[PDB]
Design a protein around this ligand. Structure first.
Ligand SMILES: CCc1nnc(NCc2ccc3[nH]ccc3c2)s1
Length: 224
């Protein structure tokens, strides 16, 4: 399959990304609590449902929530202000809450069954969100003595996600909380790392890790 791109809603961020986030790729966004990672996730869950002329892929979405932060009301707001029908947009998001890191891993296997079911339809899965990818792994494997096993489980989880992205032509989008009092970047595992932070006057700033884009959080999700 060719590489598809999903617009983020921000022309600034799209330019930094070369057009949007890529299918057949894992995009990892990391930053402090409150930097706006979940707002970018909510916006992408709407954008992917637009036609390609508007930066979408006419796609379905699968969302794995580890922290109870998915907000259907926010999806409705973004959809309404992107000229879509909010009921239709929500109908094409499949949502699940991961109870712990082992259940989170099983949900990715279940995701593959639904991906196969929609593969040959007019609304194939094009976006798989894991928000937040590391939180259960961090809370369940505390202490230096457990770090080796934590890394083992995380590496298998990421390999599973890599496989789905490439095999089924899906954009995988994962968030990761990293700050002074806790958090670890996903080493070299993601296809692409995006650092997100707050700036003066409520602006958000994005940089590619291994220019900068600037945008706001609005009723449209994010925008310049
Ligand atoms: C934990 C209870 C649920 N079981 N399923 C749900 N919603 C549908 C569903 C099923 C599998 C999934 N894999 C990733 C997202 C996703 C969504 S909610």
């Amino acid at each position: 399959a060719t590489i598809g791109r999903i617009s983020t809603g921000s022309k600034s961020l799209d330019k930094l990304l070369g057009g949007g986030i890529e299918t057949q790729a894992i995009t990892e966004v990391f930053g402090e609590f409150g930097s706006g990672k979940t707002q970018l996730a909510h916006t992408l869950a709407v954008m992917v449902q637009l036609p390609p002329e508007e930066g979408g892929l006419n796609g379905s979405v699968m969302w794995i929530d580890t922290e109870n932060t998915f907000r259907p009301e926010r999806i409705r707001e973004i959809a309404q202000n992107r000229g879509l029908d909010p009921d239709e947009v929500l109908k094409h998001i499949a949502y699940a809450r991961a109870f712990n890191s082992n259940h989170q891993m099983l949900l990715v296997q279940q995701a593959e069954d639904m991906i196969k079911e929609l593969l040959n339809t007019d609304r194939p899965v094009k976006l798989l969100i894991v928000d937040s990818l590391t939180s259960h792994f961090r809370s369940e494997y505390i202490g230096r003595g457990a770090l080796a096993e934590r890394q083992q489980k995380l590496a298998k989880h990421l390999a599973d996600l890599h496989r789905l992205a490439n095999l089924y032509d899906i954009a995988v989008f994962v968030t990761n909380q990293v700050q002074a009092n806790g958090g670890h970047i996903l080493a070299h595992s993601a296809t692409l790392r995006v650092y997100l932070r707050k700036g003066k006057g409520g602006k958000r700033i994005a940089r590619l890790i291994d220019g900068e884009a600037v945008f706001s959080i609005t009723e449209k999700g994010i925008e310049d």
